Structure 1
Amino acid sequence: LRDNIQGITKPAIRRLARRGGVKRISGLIYEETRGVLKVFLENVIRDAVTYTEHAKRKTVTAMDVVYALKRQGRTLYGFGG
C-alpha cells in the first residue's frame, strides 16, 4: 500500500510530457512529478472527502470532485455540474 505512487509509471509521465510538448526528459523529472501529482491529489481528495463528510455519505460522487476542483479554481466540465 506504498508503491501506489509508483503506479504513475515512467512511460505514463513521458506520455503526459509528450502531450505537454516536452522533447527531452531528465531522469530526476519522474520522482518530482509523482510528488507534485501526489500533492495535487492530496488537496483535491482532501476537499472531496470533506464534501462527502458534509453529505453524511460513504461514497465520493463525481459531483464532489467537480465541486472540489471548482473550489480550487480548476473547473472541470463533463461530469454533471
Structure 2
Amino acid sequence: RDNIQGITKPAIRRLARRGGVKRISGLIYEETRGVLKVFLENVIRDAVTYTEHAKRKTVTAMDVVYALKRQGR
C-alpha cells in the first residue's frame, strides 16, 4: 500500500457526513486526499521550521499551534 491510502474511504465519508453532505461522488475521495496532503505538507513544513528554531528534535504541540496560526487565518 501507499501511505496516503491509509486514510480510507469510510473516513472521508464520515468527515463528509460531519460536513452535512448527503451524497458523495466516487472521485472525490482521491481529490480530497490530494487536498489534505497539501494542507498537511504546509502545516508540517512550518511546524518543523519552528522546531528547528527552538533547537529541539521533538515537534511539540506549541510548534503545531504556531504553524496552524501562521498558515490558516
TM bucket, shorter chain = over 0.9
- Higher helix residue share: 2
With the length of structure 1 as denominator, give the TM-score of the two structures. Answer: 0.85
1:1-81 mapped onto 2 (5 Å cutoff): 3-74=2-73
- The alignment's TM-score, normalised by the length of structure 2, stands at 0.94
Q: State the 1:56 CA deviation.
A: 1.1
Moved over 2 A (4+): none
Contiguous gaps of at least 5 residues in structure 1: 75-81
The whole-number CA distance in structure 2 between the counterparts of 1:24 and 1:30 is 12
Q: What stretches of structure 2 of length at least 5 have no aligned partner?
A: none
Number of residue-to-residue matches in the alignment:
73
| Bigger RCO (CA 8 Å, 6+ sep) | 2
Q: Distance in 2 between matches of 1:63 and 1:47?
A: 12
